[model samples]
Every structure is written in C-alpha cells, then in structure tokens.
Target chain A: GNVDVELIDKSTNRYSVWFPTAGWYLWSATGLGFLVRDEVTVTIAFGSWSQHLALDLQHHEQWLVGGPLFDVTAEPEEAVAEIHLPHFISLQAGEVDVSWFLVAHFKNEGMVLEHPARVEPFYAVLESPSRIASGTRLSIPITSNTLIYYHPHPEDIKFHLYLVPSDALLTKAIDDEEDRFHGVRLQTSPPMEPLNFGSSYIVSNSANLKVMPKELKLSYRSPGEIQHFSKFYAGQMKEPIQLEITEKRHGTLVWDTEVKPVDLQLVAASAP
Target chain B: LIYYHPHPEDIKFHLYLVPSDALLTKAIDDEEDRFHGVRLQTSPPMEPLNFGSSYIVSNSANLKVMPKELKLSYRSPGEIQHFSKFYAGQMKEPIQLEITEKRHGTLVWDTEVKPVDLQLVAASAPP
Candidate 1:
C-alpha cells in the first residue's frame, strides 16, 4: 500500500491562442489585389466605444488594407473589428499612424447589425485630365501587387470610377465641395494634363520632371515592388464636337470638328 | 241619345256608351262647392257594371234635365272611389257638372283627369 503513495505524472496539456496579424479584407474586381491609396481611416475601439483616424495611406507605393465596411457598426460588439482602407492616391512609401475615438450608439433605438459588413476599396487611375475621344474604350492599368497582402483573389479586384474628361472632373469639382475637398484637393501636385489620346500633343504639366513634355506621362510608384504592381491603363477623355456640312458644286461633305472647351470656374459667390 | 225627359220629376239618368264588358265608373268634382244634398244613382246599381262595360245613371229628380251642363264619363273604379273618398272627407261644397260633348252621343266629364305623379317626399324612416 505504501508503493501507491508515489504517483507518476507523465502526461502534459498545453494551449496557445493563435491571433492573426490584425488583418483586414479588401474587395476588388481587377486582377490586381489592392491599390493602396493616399489617405486611410483606421477605426479601433475599446469595448463598445470606438475612435477613427485618417492617415496618409500611401507611405511609398504600399497597398492599402482594411477590414469590412459594415463591421464598423456595433453589433454583437464584435463588429468593431473592421478597418477601412483605400487603393488609390499613392504617396511616398512609409508606415503611418492611424487614430480613432470612443463613440457609442444605441442599438435598441438605432441601427442593428444583421450580417457581416464589408468595405469595397475601389481604384481608378487618372491620366492628367485631358480631352479624349468619345466612344473610345480606355483600359486604365491598375497595379494590384501594391495593395496590402490579403492576397486578394484575382476575381476580387474591381475598378469603379467615372470616365470623365479633365473638364468634367473640373466641372464636378466646382459643383461638389466634397469632390473638391476630398478628391481634387487631395492630389499632392497637379498631374500632367494630357489633351488628347494617341496624339502628338500630350503635355506634361510638371516642369523639370523627367517626363515627356510632348506626351503627358505619369509614373506609378509603390513603397515596395513586392507589395504593389507597377502597371498603367488608358482612359478616354472626350470633348464635345459639332458636325458641319460642306457643300461644293459637285457634292457635299460632313465632318465633326472639336468645339471650344468650356471652362469651369469655382468661386464663392456668397459668404459662408 | 237624349236620355233626360222633359218632366221635372222624371228620373234623371247618365247613359254611358262604353264598350261591352267595359267597366263604367262615375266621379264628380264635389269639392268645387256648387250645390248640396243632390243624390244620383245608376239604374244598374253603381257596383254591378263589368270592368270594360257601359251603364245608364238615373236620378229621382230628373236632375240631368235641369242642368244641361252636366258631365259624365268613364273612369277607373279606383279613381272614382278616390274622388268619392275625397269629396266625403271635409264635404266643403257641392260639385258642379260640366259636360263637353266628346263625340256624337258620347261625352267626357273631366278634361283634367290624369295619372297621379308623385315626387320625392320627406322620409318617415331612413333606409
């Protein structure tokens, strides 16, 4: 009976929590995974309260990565885990700090989460506003490799944007403050304003830059070549043209001629 | 036919040349206030005439001869009864007889005899 007093312990149990790299998801339709843009908002929360911070997402040609869109709402309390990022507006590559706040909303009287939410990071490559041909199919090359690594499936890469001539974007910028404030103003420097597509006159607005003065050429850079792909696509810049008829003694000829471009001027007419 | 005799005491009668099997009915404008207490009857008794028949009226005083302007005509039984009821009610005045010869040996008493037309009246009970 005394021999039983010495109990042998040979088995051991151990467990470890495997946490991912605080990862985020991006949805796309283009083959490119994600295009890290210039500005980003990363929202974090403590318990139910949350905070958000806008950062220069393009710290070098890095891919912008973020969490789901609707996950931003508080539901099951777990919805607080998503971060939203963009795939446009590239800046000098570097790591950036994102800030947030502690804010809460009532679930009983307000919105409730029914399903997982998502944010779609869409990217459109702009080739300095220029007059393009109407009915021309433009392929704006999107660099997917630069996007943050969720290894976005090729099918998930999507491109959504309006194909407007430089004039139209300018007109929209004058009309919509949000477009001017967030969109037109966000560009660090004016891009080369290309006037025509596949023509001799592609003027580079950037002076002293190693770009062609004849054909407006803009280069895409990524923080790391491993993160973002260096690629470009074409966009059509259209101008309104008028059709005219020329009558001669023998016959008549009809031709379309480009009309004068309309200027969009944005000025504060009334006191804010 | 000249049914009234010259004698003042001879029975006065109303002769109607109505079709055979046709009803003969009598109505008077008693409410016109002309005479009083004069009674007249038909030889066949007022109720026995067929619906589409004719009859001769008789009076003990030969009143039809005294009043050459007497009137007589065919009428519906219902219409005659209606006039009789109205005349009996109130009985304000005696009636005058005005006869206009409608045809040879045929006469019509009242030219204003017509179907009653009723319009909307106040409802005693709501539907």
Candidate 2:
C-alpha cells in the first residue's frame, strides 16, 4: 500500500489541505487521537502576544475531496497532496486575534505494504507587503525529498510552502524554515538611501508567496545616507541557494544551502 | 708642554719647578771623604707647597754661585662637564670628573662632562 501527504503555506492564517493519494482522509485531530470524532483547533502565539488559528478534521469527518488528492496501490508512481491558507491576520493587542494550525498523519495498510507517517503543522511569518494584502498569488514549489520534521513519514514525504512578508527576510525565520522564499517591493516604495546590508527580514513558511524577482535592488552607503542609493541593487546583492534532492530506498532527502552574495555586471554611463 | 683640562672661563696660569742636574749637585751641602769640602748651611724646604718666585745655587768645588729668577704662568681650573662623582655619605661632597683628560709628561687627568638637552618634534611636522 502507498500514501502521500502535502502541507502548503497558503496565507498568513488559513490553509486548505488536499490529498493526491488514496486510502487517506483528513482527520481533525489535535494530538494523538484528539480528533476522534470532533474538530480540533491548533493555536500559535508570537512573542508580542499575537495568536493565530488552524483547524483539523478526522478521517470519517471529511467527504471525499477531488481538489488535491489522488490514490494509487503501487510503488514507483507519483502522489501529490496540496494545502493552502486563504487569509492571514496581524495579532493586535493579543486579544484581537486567535491563531490556528493543522497537523496531518497517514497510515498505509494495504495487501502488500504497511506505511505509517505523521506531519506536525509548521508555520512561518512572511515579511512582505502582500502578506497583509488580500488576493496575493504566492507560489511555493515542492519536491520529493523535503523533510517534514515534526511529523516524519519514512514511507511518505511532505513539503510546506509559506507566504510571508519580504521584509521578514531581514530578521527571523518563519516556523523554523528560515530559507523560505521572500521579497520586498523596493520599486513600489520610495527609495531608502545609504542602505544597511545587515538588517534582517522575516520570511517563514506561514507567510504569503508572490515573489517579484526583478524589481528588487540592493545598495550600500553610509548607514545614515540610505536614501542616496539606487534601486538596481538586487542584481548585485542577491545570493545563490543550493537545494539537493536525494532519493533513498525508503524515502528521499532534500538539503538547501546558500551561496554568498551573487554578483551582477556593472554598467557605467558617460559624464554629463 | 702640559695640556690643561679646565673650562674656557676658568682657565688660569701657574708654574711648578723641578731641580736640574747641576742644581742638584750644587744644592748638596757637604762631603766627608778626602778632597771633599764641608761648608754647608741649613737645608731648604724639601717639598714646599709654595716655591718662591726665584732661586740661587752655588757649587763649592768650583767657587762659583749663580742666581736666577723665574716666573710661572698657568690657567686656573675652569668649570667643566660633571662626568661622575664619588661620595661616602649624605653630608659629604661628591668627587667630580671632567669631560676631557689633561696630559703632562706621563700623567693624565680627566675633565668633567656636562648634561645638555635635545628637542623632538611630531613626525608629520617639521622640527
């Protein structure tokens, strides 16, 4: 028997789950068997007393959904599962917001095989303008080897895509996934001069997605004169990331590392 | 010639006399052996600190006496560089040494050494 699961970082607060492999159902469980018959709510709180919510459903509770789940009875075939969050909230005063998260586990007991796997829901806070905006299209790619640590599936694999604010890239990691895709729209915002290169931005798995690659630029000058810098700094300041995907007998492994400051060709203009 | 080691301001002139060969024999008073005369007077000062400005000598064998007067000129010890000093205790004065040496015959005397100051300036600026 074979099973597959998918976790998606959709919006800041909401995620939709879809199973591409059969013999699986969405269980509304908080912990081990916590969702035996009823829905379970998972809440997360930030350092500033902010909170978010996630919901889960049990195997018998969810109707057979056709959106992101499909099942097969054999090995060597591809199984894809996807989940998305529709909304994210900024927890103001810790009282105005309640947060939610989701955890999923799958067991494959078929005629010839037995595969048991669990995934603990992970969240990241994105640092970009779109994370707060509605209807932002964020794209996160998943491969065969990405590890879902909270819930490990030796016989199954999972990937999580977080949509966060680009500026969050400057500071903290979202849900322990510090290497998530992030961006800041410097073009839309007025240029800041003498930019400091070391300030951090927060990009985690629970944030927004749509990454605008070309519009970003990075410049360096005195820390105080950040406004005198140019908007074409991204080409010179971007770094290369290396992600390795390896296939194993029981499962696959994916590793991601970064290469320092990617360089760009500099073009000079004649004197005025 | 004897070289003086005093400073320029303290230089003065002085003299010292040593007996010549003829003066030594004439200055002797008597001989007791045969054919030797014994007409002698009192002995002059053996080692006088102050020798009078003149002297006379007479040889009894030749019945001749000659008289001569000599004047000595010298520089006084002048202020010199204080090189080093020796002291016994707190109440005692220190022995001084000069910066140079005086040579007279086979004798040598050292002068004192005086201290002087030199100035320094910043590396970037002219002295």
Candidate 3:
C-alpha cells in the first residue's frame, strides 16, 4: 500500500513514520502541537516533516513566510526541527498577524505529509516616552515579549521599532498620510527614525522629562476590556510608560500620545 | 522572572547618582562611535567589562554615558570583607534601602523614608 503526498489529512490522522525499520509509529498533529518557540529558535517536531511554509499566517489565510532560499534544518534523528524565521524580518506589535505558520513536503518521500509547523502567538509591548519633545529623532526599543521566546543575543530577536505618532491631528495640515499596521493606524509619524534597544533596554530614551498633550487619551478596543490612559499632567507624563499591545486575533486601538513642542510663534525678524 | 521565559535580562539599564567627588574623565572602551555628546566618566576609571559580562546601560541623554554603575546599598547592609567586582547582575528585592535624592531645592535632600513597595517588571505576556 502507498500513501499520496498530501496536505489532505485530518488533525486526527495517525502515522507509523518509522516504517523503514519496519516499526510502527503513532502520532497526531493538532493545531500547534508540532511547533515551539524556544529561546532562539522555533522548533517543529514530528516523526517526519517538510521544509518551509507559506506564512500569511495561514488557511485562516497564509502569508508566504520566505523566499526560495529559506528552509528549516532538523536533527539527525529528525526530532528537533530548528528553524529561525529569517533575519531582518519584523512584524508590528499587536495580537494577530504575528502568529506565523510553517510547513511543506517532498517528492521522493513515500506517502508524504504536508503539515504546518506552529504558531504560539506572542504578546508585545512598545514604550514610547509618554512625553517627548514631539518629533525628535531617537529610536530606543525599551521593551518586548520576544525575550520570553528567544535567547540573549543583541541581534537574535530583530525588531525595528517605529514611534508611529498615533494621535493629535489638527484639521489644518491634513496633507499627511497615516501610518498603519493590521488595522491600528497612527495619525502621523512625527517621530521619525525607527529606534532600537541598542545593546540594552530602558524606559525613556529622550532627555530628562516631558509629557503627551493632556487633552488627548490613548485607547485600544479588543476582546478583553479596553485600555485608556490620559490622566496625566506635563510633569508626570514624562515617566516611561509601556503601551500594552494586544494578543491573538484582530484588535482596534486608538490614540497613544506624544509631547508636541508647544507653539513658538515664528518671530521672523526682518533683519537686513 | 516569568515561567518558561529566558533570563529576564538581555541588556540592563542601570542608573547611579554621581556625587561631586566622582570626577568625569575620558577613557577607552570597545566601541567609540556608539557614544555621543559630553561623556561623563569617573576619574580613576572603572574596570572595562569582560566580553561575557552582562552589559550595563552606559549611555545617557547628555549624548554621553554616565560614569557610574548602580551603587545601591542598604542602611542595614555592608558585609565589608567582601568587595566583589561582579559589575552587573540580577538581585532579590524586599530588603529596606537607603535611597536619598535632592527632590526639592538645592538646600534640601529627600530620603526614601518608606520601604520599596514593589520592585517588579511586568511581563507583558499571557498568564
């Protein structure tokens, strides 16, 4: 009897993968049972598996994960499937799109099985100086949930953080385009230049102190209770505050703040 | 520290208040370009960290790095015989601390008269 190379198996499909030794094996592939997020690598484990996956995150719709050059390596025993998503690849912090999927099969294999890898969704936190001298160029990524999933190497978890200014749009200058990720969009990107955690992490990357405009409050709507913060004064707002990113599935969030440089009337002296 | 997570620190940010005595000088280190502005350094020069050392936050808003590391000590502490040179690390919390700072006018100094209520980093992850 022969089995066709298939992606057409149920999560309950049982297998005898050690058929070569004439021995039988029994294992099932549930949603995330075959994958893992170890310190530095994502492990895909199964009796036998394929190379890479189409990563649109999946049949829920798939986001093609890599180019042809990307593939995974397995232990000689084919037990530990060590995979690093790829370098320079980054997804914004929130609930949904970050959950990556993986899988594929080969031709020479008897009855090939094309099962997906894994996607243990991660929660992320981004801290913008609750107070800033609006629109200064500085990039300091002070926090993340990636550390819980990866190891301690400055470059291991490569996340390029953007201080996408999410609020305070005066109707006057409507000429600017909005910055977006999934569905959460920011009013403007006054703070240019993406910041990073460099070699270390800290709460505030700007000077001594500052605060977001008091008139505006930040909010995000998700399945759980929503979060809002605006009860702040100029003096207290400069404290480092980590904006809570959502977890698993789509979420709609609103206006996080930034300290705008108070108006300095242009005293354009007509100096000869 | 969270369960199943890696060590709570990758690179740590430490703050130390420098008194009038510690002189700010110039010195050599592994990387130069990464630093900017007026670098405040110690006079005698602190030891350069080994490659394996857990890094300390050595830079600041002055565009330069502050010269001191965390010199936190408790009023009830000081097992003097041991002058360990382990520069950076993690420690347990809860012991009373002797924290004082110039919170108001130059003529006044404020102390942490109360115990540190909470010393925890919120792990932004699912429980």
* Best model number under TM-score: 3
Give interface RMSD, per candidate.
54.9, 49.0, 17.2
| Most accurate candidate by DockQ | 3
lDDT of 2 by residue, A120-211 (tens): 22211111110111111111113211211111111111111122111111212121111111123222212222222321221222121221
Better of 2 and 3 by DockQ: 3
Q: What is the C-alpha RMSD of each candidate to the true structure, in Å?
A: 45.5, 45.6, 22.5
* Model 2 chain B lDDT-worst window of ten: B118-127
lDDT of 2 by residue, B1-127 (tens): 2111111101111213332110111111111101111111112211101111011111111111112212122221112222223311111111112222121111112232321111111111101
| Per-residue accuracy of model 3 over A185-271 as CA lDDT, tens digit each | 121112222222221211111111122323233421111111110101001101122232321111111222333322211111121
DockQ of predicted model 1: 0.00
Docking class of 2: incorrect
Q: Which ranges in model 2 have alpha carbons more than 4 Å from their true place?
A: A1-36, A39-171, A176-218, A221-272, B1-127
**Candidate 1, A211-270: lDDT as tens digits:** 111212221110100111111100111111111121111110111122221111122112
Candidates sorted by TM-score, best first:
3, 1, 2
